[PDB]
Design a protein around this ligand. Structure first.
Ligand SMILES: *[C@@H]1O[C@H](CO)[C@@H](O)[C@H](O)[C@H]1NC(C)=O
Ligand SMILES: *[C@@H]1O[C@H](CO)[C@@H](O)[C@H](O)[C@H]1NC(C)=O
Lengths: 39, 50
């Protein structure tokens, strides 16, 4: 659905919070330090 | 794959298919002339002359 700048890609999978499109969802979460991750 | 002799292989997904689909699902996708019209990135195809 284009290219996303600012959100870090992660290899895990959770419930959808912000639906990007084409099977990607982003959410604001702690790294371990809080950022926007996409999955 | 013994469900009492019932042949469920035509609707269960085929592991050989990379899309994890079945025979009837593949026939249903092939029987519709679906136009994506911008599902993927294709501005590079637009800027290329044809
Ligand atoms: C189910 O039907 C398919 C299609 O003819 C056949 O290849 C397969 O051997 C059948 N399986 C069983 C368990 O009867
Ligand atoms: C999009 O970019 C990738 C690499 O950045 C390239 O491999 C691909 O062919 C490009 N697709 C189009 C339609 O321009």
């Amino acid at each position: 659905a284009g290219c996303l700048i600012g959100a870090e890609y992660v290899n895990n999978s959770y419930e959808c919070d912000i639906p990007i499109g084409a099977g990607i969802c982003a959410s604001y979460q702690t790294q371990t330090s809080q950022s926007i991750i996409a999955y | 794959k013994y469900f009492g002799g019932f042949n469920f292989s035509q609707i269960l997904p085929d592991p050989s298919k990379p899309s994890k689909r079945s025979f009837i699902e593949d026939l249903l996708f092939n029987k519709v002339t679906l136009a994506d019209a911008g599902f993927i990135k294709q501005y590079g195809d637009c800027l290329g002359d044809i």
